[PDB]
Amino acid sequence: EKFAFQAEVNRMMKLIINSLYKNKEIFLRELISNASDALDKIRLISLTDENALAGNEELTVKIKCDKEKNLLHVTDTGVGMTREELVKNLGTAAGTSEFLNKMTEASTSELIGQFGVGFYSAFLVADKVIVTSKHNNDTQHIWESDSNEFSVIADPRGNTLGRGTTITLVLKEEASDYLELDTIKNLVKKYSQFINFPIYVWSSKTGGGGKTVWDWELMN
Ligand SMILES: COC1=C2C[C@@H](C)C[C@H](OC)[C@H](O)[C@@H](C)/C=C(\C)[C@H](OC(N)=O)[C@@H](OC)/C=C\C=C(/C)C(=O)NC(=CC1=O)C2=O
């Protein structure tokens, strides 16, 4: 059922990702960029095929800090991924050479994005990463990994996303700060530069008369 990452690829990625230890907050920049790409794709598709947005009529990025469960969620209503794409694109050449040539013969913070491995920076702050996704052409599925092995299963909750993807991070004890609204809001704003889609953070808001209310708060 489960899978294991390629021995050499894993080892090399461990070193690549670890080199970003002085600026771990970049994982959020990468997840936001990924969401932006998924949203650009569904937006382009919707220009000629309006029914493409039927499963969820909105184009947004919504972030939720679940202090109660020690989880950080980054959800987009982009194009989503099929079960095969989760297994194939989050599980697997001599292209590694091209990556270390860029490493040694040449910055890591700007190379991961270009090499298409920025997603893995999530492991800088998380012991486990879960990817829940729903694409128009398939049912909702869940990918899970501890950075060494991974598995994919049909989501028993059914199609709850409508369309899109949720990146769920099980935060390391030393990354509890990322559950704080102020910290998350600050980072989102710092990394919501060229994203042409609204990004929200589920937050507490002043409700008046001493009342506290919760709602999505626009960051860009
Ligand atoms: C150019 O596309 C990108 C690729 C190539 C490829 C895998 C694209 C993918 O093909 C199935 C879909 O077309 C695309 C819409 C899905 C996302 C961007 C997902 O994010 C969300 N929010 O859906 C992301 O989930 C973690 C997919 C894995 C990301 C990896 C391994 C990475 O590190 N960098 C990548 C960032 C990218 O932008 C990357 O490799």
Side-chain angles (χ1 to χ4, degrees), residues 31 33-35 37-38 41 76 79-81 85 89-90 116-120 131 165 167:
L31 300 186
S33 288
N34 290 353
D37 181 56
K41 288 174 177 171
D76 65 76
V79 66
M81 299 173 273
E85 294 178 315
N89 298 82
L90 289 177
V117 300
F119 162 70
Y120 300 102
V131 177
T165 300
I167 308 302

Tab-separated table of all heavy atoms in Angstrom, residues 31 33-35 37-38 41 76 79-81 85 89-90 116-120 131 165 167, ligand 1:
chain	number	residue	atom	x	y	z
A	31	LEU	N	4.515	27.089	-0.049
A	31	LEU	CA	3.154	26.558	-0.098
A	31	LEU	C	2.193	27.576	-0.723
A	31	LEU	O	1.249	27.197	-1.414
A	31	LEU	CB	2.668	26.161	1.304
A	31	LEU	CG	3.496	25.088	2.033
A	31	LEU	CD1	2.808	24.702	3.339
A	31	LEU	CD2	3.656	23.857	1.149
A	33	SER	N	3.098	29.830	-2.969
A	33	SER	CA	3.447	29.844	-4.387
A	33	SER	C	2.824	28.651	-5.108
A	33	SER	O	2.344	28.771	-6.240
A	33	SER	CB	4.968	29.808	-4.565
A	33	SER	OG	5.556	31.043	-4.200
A	34	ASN	N	2.842	27.495	-4.451
A	34	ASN	CA	2.269	26.292	-5.032
A	34	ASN	C	0.767	26.496	-5.211
A	34	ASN	O	0.213	26.171	-6.254
A	34	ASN	CB	2.532	25.084	-4.129
A	34	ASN	CG	3.998	24.679	-4.110
A	34	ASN	OD1	4.808	25.208	-4.872
A	34	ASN	ND2	4.344	23.730	-3.243
A	35	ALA	N	0.111	27.040	-4.192
A	35	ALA	CA	-1.331	27.278	-4.270
A	35	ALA	C	-1.640	28.236	-5.423
A	35	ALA	O	-2.616	28.062	-6.146
A	35	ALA	CB	-1.842	27.856	-2.950
A	37	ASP	N	0.041	28.643	-8.177
A	37	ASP	CA	0.190	27.915	-9.437
A	37	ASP	C	-1.038	27.054	-9.723
A	37	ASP	O	-1.525	27.013	-10.856
A	37	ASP	CB	1.434	27.020	-9.399
A	37	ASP	CG	1.648	26.254	-10.702
A	37	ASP	OD1	1.737	26.898	-11.769
A	37	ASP	OD2	1.731	25.009	-10.662
A	38	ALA	N	-1.530	26.356	-8.700
A	38	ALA	CA	-2.712	25.500	-8.858
A	38	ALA	C	-3.933	26.357	-9.216
A	38	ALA	O	-4.781	25.954	-10.021
A	38	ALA	CB	-2.977	24.721	-7.563
A	41	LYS	N	-3.758	27.634	-12.828
A	41	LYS	CA	-4.136	26.562	-13.733
A	41	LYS	C	-5.643	26.369	-13.865
A	41	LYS	O	-6.152	26.247	-14.979
A	41	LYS	CB	-3.452	25.255	-13.314
A	41	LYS	CG	-1.951	25.269	-13.601
A	41	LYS	CD	-1.222	24.047	-13.056
A	41	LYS	CE	0.253	24.094	-13.442
A	41	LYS	NZ	1.066	23.039	-12.771
A	76	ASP	N	-6.230	25.618	-0.900
A	76	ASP	CA	-6.506	26.394	-2.101
A	76	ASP	C	-7.609	25.695	-2.875
A	76	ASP	O	-7.818	24.486	-2.733
A	76	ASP	CB	-5.265	26.501	-2.997
A	76	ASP	CG	-4.834	25.153	-3.570
A	76	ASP	OD1	-5.488	24.646	-4.515
A	76	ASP	OD2	-3.838	24.596	-3.066
A	79	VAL	N	-6.653	23.752	-9.102
A	79	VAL	CA	-7.015	22.593	-9.914
A	79	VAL	C	-7.023	21.229	-9.209
A	79	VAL	O	-7.714	20.309	-9.648
A	79	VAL	CB	-6.112	22.512	-11.174
A	79	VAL	CG1	-4.674	22.230	-10.769
A	79	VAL	CG2	-6.636	21.440	-12.142
A	80	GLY	N	-6.271	21.095	-8.119
A	80	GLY	CA	-6.232	19.826	-7.411
A	80	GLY	C	-5.387	18.781	-8.122
A	80	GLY	O	-4.866	19.036	-9.208
A	81	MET	N	-5.255	17.604	-7.506
A	81	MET	CA	-4.469	16.500	-8.055
A	81	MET	C	-5.228	15.180	-7.928
A	81	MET	O	-5.941	14.953	-6.942
A	81	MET	CB	-3.140	16.370	-7.304
A	81	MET	CG	-2.248	17.590	-7.399
A	81	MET	SD	-0.793	17.464	-6.347
A	81	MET	CE	-1.440	18.109	-4.795
A	85	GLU	N	-1.454	11.427	-9.626
A	85	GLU	CA	-0.535	12.554	-9.544
A	85	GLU	C	0.072	12.673	-8.148
A	85	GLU	O	1.213	13.118	-7.999
A	85	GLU	CB	-1.248	13.856	-9.938
A	85	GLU	CG	-1.683	13.909	-11.409
A	85	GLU	CD	-2.424	15.190	-11.763
A	85	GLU	OE1	-3.303	15.609	-10.981
A	85	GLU	OE2	-2.141	15.776	-12.828
A	89	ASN	N	3.816	12.446	-8.532
A	89	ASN	CA	4.507	13.716	-8.314
A	89	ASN	C	4.971	14.011	-6.897
A	89	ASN	O	5.685	14.988	-6.666
A	89	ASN	CB	3.651	14.870	-8.826
A	89	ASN	CG	3.407	14.780	-10.313
A	89	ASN	OD1	2.526	14.052	-10.767
A	89	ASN	ND2	4.207	15.506	-11.086
A	90	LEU	N	4.561	13.180	-5.948
A	90	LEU	CA	4.983	13.343	-4.563
A	90	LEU	C	5.574	12.010	-4.120
A	90	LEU	O	5.292	11.515	-3.030
A	90	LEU	CB	3.799	13.731	-3.672
A	90	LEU	CG	3.252	15.148	-3.867
A	90	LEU	CD1	2.043	15.362	-2.962
A	90	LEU	CD2	4.347	16.161	-3.554
A	116	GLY	N	11.564	22.780	-8.560
A	116	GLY	CA	10.291	22.132	-8.296
A	116	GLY	C	10.277	21.182	-7.112
A	116	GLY	O	9.649	20.125	-7.173
A	117	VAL	N	10.965	21.549	-6.035
A	117	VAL	CA	11.002	20.718	-4.833
A	117	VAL	C	10.712	21.560	-3.598
A	117	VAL	O	10.923	21.110	-2.474
A	117	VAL	CB	12.386	20.050	-4.634
A	117	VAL	CG1	12.715	19.160	-5.820
A	117	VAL	CG2	13.458	21.115	-4.442
A	118	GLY	N	10.230	22.781	-3.818
A	118	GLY	CA	9.940	23.679	-2.715
A	118	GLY	C	8.973	23.109	-1.696
A	118	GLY	O	9.038	23.440	-0.513
A	119	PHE	N	8.073	22.248	-2.153
A	119	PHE	CA	7.083	21.642	-1.269
A	119	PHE	C	7.726	21.011	-0.041
A	119	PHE	O	7.219	21.148	1.068
A	119	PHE	CB	6.281	20.574	-2.023
A	119	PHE	CG	5.551	19.614	-1.121
A	119	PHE	CD1	4.452	20.030	-0.374
A	119	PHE	CD2	5.978	18.296	-1.007
A	119	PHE	CE1	3.787	19.145	0.472
A	119	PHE	CE2	5.321	17.402	-0.161
A	119	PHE	CZ	4.220	17.832	0.581
A	120	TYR	N	8.847	20.330	-0.243
A	120	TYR	CA	9.528	19.646	0.849
A	120	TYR	C	10.080	20.532	1.967
A	120	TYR	O	10.479	20.025	3.019
A	120	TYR	CB	10.627	18.747	0.274
A	120	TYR	CG	10.065	17.697	-0.656
A	120	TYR	CD1	10.163	17.839	-2.040
A	120	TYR	CD2	9.365	16.598	-0.157
A	120	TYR	CE1	9.571	16.920	-2.906
A	120	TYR	CE2	8.768	15.671	-1.016
A	120	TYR	CZ	8.875	15.843	-2.388
A	120	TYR	OH	8.281	14.945	-3.244
A	131	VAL	N	-1.356	15.689	2.527
A	131	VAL	CA	-1.872	16.416	1.378
A	131	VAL	C	-3.219	15.818	0.998
A	131	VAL	O	-3.309	14.649	0.615
A	131	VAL	CB	-0.896	16.342	0.173
A	131	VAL	CG1	-1.488	17.058	-1.044
A	131	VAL	CG2	0.426	16.990	0.552
A	165	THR	N	-6.790	21.704	-2.911
A	165	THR	CA	-5.830	20.985	-2.092
A	165	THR	C	-5.571	21.615	-0.734
A	165	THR	O	-5.494	22.836	-0.608
A	165	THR	CB	-4.481	20.903	-2.837
A	165	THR	OG1	-4.668	20.222	-4.082
A	165	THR	CG2	-3.429	20.185	-1.995
A	167	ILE	N	-2.840	21.439	2.438
A	167	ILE	CA	-1.545	20.952	2.904
A	167	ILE	C	-1.675	21.044	4.419
A	167	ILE	O	-1.902	22.132	4.952
A	167	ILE	CB	-0.366	21.856	2.467
A	167	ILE	CG1	-0.397	22.108	0.954
A	167	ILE	CG2	0.954	21.198	2.878
A	167	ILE	CD1	-0.350	20.845	0.092
B	1	LIG	C1	4.656	23.714	-11.816
B	1	LIG	O1	3.958	22.988	-10.799
B	1	LIG	C2	4.760	22.716	-9.732
B	1	LIG	C3	5.442	21.502	-9.666
B	1	LIG	C4	5.280	20.450	-10.768
B	1	LIG	C5	4.075	19.539	-10.520
B	1	LIG	C6	4.379	18.503	-9.435
B	1	LIG	C7	2.773	20.340	-10.619
B	1	LIG	C8	1.558	19.471	-10.281
B	1	LIG	O2	1.538	18.338	-11.163
B	1	LIG	C9	0.716	17.289	-10.640
B	1	LIG	C10	0.270	20.287	-10.435
B	1	LIG	O3	0.136	20.715	-11.794
B	1	LIG	C11	0.217	21.512	-9.517
B	1	LIG	C12	-1.000	22.381	-9.842
B	1	LIG	C13	0.133	21.092	-8.048
B	1	LIG	C14	0.783	21.787	-7.034
B	1	LIG	C15	1.651	23.013	-7.331
B	1	LIG	C16	0.623	21.291	-5.594
B	1	LIG	O4	0.267	22.380	-4.726
B	1	LIG	C17	-1.057	22.694	-4.735
B	1	LIG	N1	-1.454	23.695	-3.954
B	1	LIG	O5	-1.837	22.062	-5.447
B	1	LIG	C18	1.898	20.660	-5.053
B	1	LIG	O6	1.569	20.064	-3.788
B	1	LIG	C19	2.723	19.907	-2.958
B	1	LIG	C20	2.429	19.639	-6.067
B	1	LIG	C21	3.810	19.072	-5.730
B	1	LIG	C22	4.809	20.038	-5.653
B	1	LIG	C23	6.179	19.807	-5.734
B	1	LIG	C24	6.704	18.383	-5.931
B	1	LIG	C25	7.190	20.953	-5.615
B	1	LIG	O7	8.026	20.903	-4.716
B	1	LIG	N2	7.146	21.973	-6.472
B	1	LIG	C26	6.314	22.162	-7.496
B	1	LIG	C27	5.618	23.364	-7.574
B	1	LIG	C28	4.845	23.642	-8.697
B	1	LIG	O8	4.240	24.710	-8.781
B	1	LIG	C29	6.225	21.245	-8.541
B	1	LIG	O9	6.890	20.212	-8.491
